[PDB]
Chains A and B, each alone.
Chain A
Amino acid sequence: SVLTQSPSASGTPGQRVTISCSGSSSNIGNNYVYWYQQLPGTAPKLLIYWNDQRPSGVPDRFSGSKSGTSASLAISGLRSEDEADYYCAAWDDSLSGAVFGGGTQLTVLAPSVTLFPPSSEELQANKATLVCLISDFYPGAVTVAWKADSSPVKAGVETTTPSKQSNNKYAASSYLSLTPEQWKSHRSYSCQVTHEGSTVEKTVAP
């Protein structure tokens, strides 16, 4: 009735990993199993068709296995471009439907900071937004703290999750929501990025 996948998997470049997909008899066993890859921000692409067949273009590094109750996808010579989500698929003849697995997020193992103040246009729209931009950092983990003059700010702070850029480094952005009054009335505002324990700070004033 359902296809059970491990939510994540990991490995080093050159390593070999095996992603499992368990099911039942109405889904797996009597019907073939299918394998697909989703890279960040892109549509899914066919990887393995008919249990163990690679369509044109799929590198031989990817291989499928199929048993009675389960199925597997073996990845040899792991590469960083393989960091993506992997899904298995099977048919329920009884439910008359496709069923997807939960997906396996496979992860394959200093930040640059630019700070913008609220624009005069936005001040004319009676809003004040501070924009703190982080790119090209690895590993994908940072901790950010905001300052008004010299005191911390937690109200109105909104921060994104790190995302693997095209260059396999990570990007992240942080916003401080302020009123134009808060913006003008303080001497300055500061953005603080901590990454690998090291700290980079930028400051702006009205």
Chain B
Amino acid sequence: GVQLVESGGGLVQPGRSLRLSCAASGFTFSNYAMYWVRQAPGKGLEWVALISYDISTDYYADSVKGRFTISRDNSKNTIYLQMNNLRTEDTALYYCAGNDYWGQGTLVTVSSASTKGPSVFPLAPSSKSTSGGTAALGCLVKDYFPEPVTVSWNSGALTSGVHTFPAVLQSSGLYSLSSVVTVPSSSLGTQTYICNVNHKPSNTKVDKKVEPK
């Protein structure tokens, strides 16, 4: 099937440059014209640039005119967004997705200014767990800039009951998010619940076991 994967996202100083890549599969790449679209945090969609199927005609939005350069390799089936003179307004999720098929974008967060590994403390349950009832546990991922941080449970084997909440920006300027799961209480002493936390922008991988104190 038509698959589209965006690459090249991360932290990149303003007025620096960052080039994004788009791997396509499942269709004749050379036969389709392609798009670049970005979405600032919690904002609406904004078009960036356009390349004809072959590299021929290429058009831009005035927000990126002169700074960004769109390119592709029809022999490598790859799309490129050479962004130059990056700005704070360029902080966005950049999606590469020839209309009729769309891939999961890639985060491009400004410069920014220092940072970081997140710290990952546990949110352990309580002995008072409804004797024969539901309990809840989770992990707390504090003090971190930029987004994103991804938290899974039992290497993905546990999905039922999981809530992963939006990260918040503390007054320090770092983010903090937590991730929770509801579980039976009979299974507290007999099953292993481990959160797999990941902050790619700084390469932090933490697998954390949560158990009662």
Contact = CB atoms under 8 A, between A and B. Distances in A.
A and B touch in their complex, CB below 8 angstroms: yes
Q: Which applies to chain B's interface (DSSP): helix, strand, loop or mixed?
A: strand
B35 interface: yes
Interface size class of A (residues with CB under 8 A): 35 or more
Nearest to A99: B47
Q: Which applies to chain A's interface (DSSP): helix, strand, loop or mixed?
A: strand
Contact of A127 (B46, B101, B102, B142): B142
Interface string A76-119: 00000000010100000001111110110000000000101011
Interface in A115-168: 116, 118-122, 125, 127, 129, 131, 133, 135, 158, 160-161, 163, 165
Given A100-B44, A116-B138, A122-B142, A43 B103 contact: yes
A173 interface: yes
Interface size class of B (residues with CB under 8 A): 35 or more
Contact of A177 (B99, B121, B170): B170
Contacts of A49: 99-100
Given A165-B163, A175-B168, A133 B44 contact: no
A46 interface: yes
Contact of B123 (A34, A100, A116, A163): A116
Interface of A: 34, 38, 43-46, 49, 55, 85, 87, 95-100, 102-103, 114, 116, 118-122, 125, 127, 129, 131, 133, 135, 158, 160-161, 163, 165, 171-173, 175, 177
